C-alpha cells in the first residue's frame, strides 16, 4: 500500500506494464508513467526521471537499456537502496550484461 512501481518506456512497454495493473494518479494527479518516443527530448526525460525519484511514494523504477543510456550519468549518479532503479531488456533493446549499475557495483567478481 506504501509504494508504487514506476514506468518510463516506449508505447509498447508502457501499454504492457499498465496492463500489468500498476499506475496511479498522485496528489497533483500526474501519471505514474511517462511516454518516451523518437519525438521526446532529453531534458524532458531527465526532468521527469528526477520528478519521479523525488516523489518518495514510488519506490521502484523501471527503465530499459536505451532510456537509461541516454541519461547515463544521471543514472549512475544514484547510489541508494530504497528508491531502486531497474535495468530491464527490451524487444527493441535486448539486454547487454556488461551494462548495469548494480553489476557495476559488483564489477570485478567473475
Amino acid at each position: 500500500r506504501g509504494k508504487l512501481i514506476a514506468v518510463i518506456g516506449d508505447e509498447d512497454t508502457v501499454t504492457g506494464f499498465l496492463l500489468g495493473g500498476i499506475g496511479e494518479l498522485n496528489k497533483n494527479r500526474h501519471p505514474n508513467f511517462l511516454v518516451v518516443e523518437k519525438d521526446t527530448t532529453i531534458n524532458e526525460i531527465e526532468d521527469t526521471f528526477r520528478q519521479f525519484l523525488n516523489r518518495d511514494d514510488i519506490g521502484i523504477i523501471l527503465i530499459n537499456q536505451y532510456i537509461a543510456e541516454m541519461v547515463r550519468h544521471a543514472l549512475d549518479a544514484h547510489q541508494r537502496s530504497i528508491p531502486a532503479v531497474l535495468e530491464i531488456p527490451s524487444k527493441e533493446h535486448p539486454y547487454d550484461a556488461a551494462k548495469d549499475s548494480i553489476l557495476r557495483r559488483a564489477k570485478g567478481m567473475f
Binding site: 512501481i5 511516454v35 537502496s81 530491464i88
Partner: protein, 99 residues
C-alpha cells in the same frame, strides 16, 4: 542473478509476442489503455530483511484488487487482452522478486 534476469528476458519475449497478437486480433486499444489511468492495481508493502546482523530493504507484491478495464467494444477483444493481462501479472511479481 544473471540467470533470473535471462529468465525475465524469456518471459518478456513471450509478453511481446502476446502483445503482437493483441495488436493483430483487435487492431488498436493502446491509446485507450494509456488514456484511462486513475488508480493502480498492484502496490508494494515496504519491508526489511534481517539476513545478517545488518538489515537490507525488501519489497512485497500486493494485489490491491482494482477492477481491470473491460475491452468489449473493439472487436470484442476480451480473451486476448485477458491473456496479455495474465502474462504481465506474472511479469510484475517476478520483477518484484528481482527488485
Amino acid at each position: 542473478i544473471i540467470e533470473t534476469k535471462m529468465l525475465m528476458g524469456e518471459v518478456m519475449r513471450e509478453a511481446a509476442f502476446s502483445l503482437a497478437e493483441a495488436k493483430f486480433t483487435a487492431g488498436d486499444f493502446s491509446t485507450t489503455v494509456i488514456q484511462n489511468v486513475n488508480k493502480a492495481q498492484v502496490k508494494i508493502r515496504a519491508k526489511k530483511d534481517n539476513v545478517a546482523g545488518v538489515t537490507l530493504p525488501v519489497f512485497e507484491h500486493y494485489h490491491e484488487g482494482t477492477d481491470s478495464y473491460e475491452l468489449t467494444g473493439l472487436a470484442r477483444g476480451g480473451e486476448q487482452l485477458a491473456k496479455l493481462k495474465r502474462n504481465y501479472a506474472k511479469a510484475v511479481e517476478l520483477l518484484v522478486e528481482l527488485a
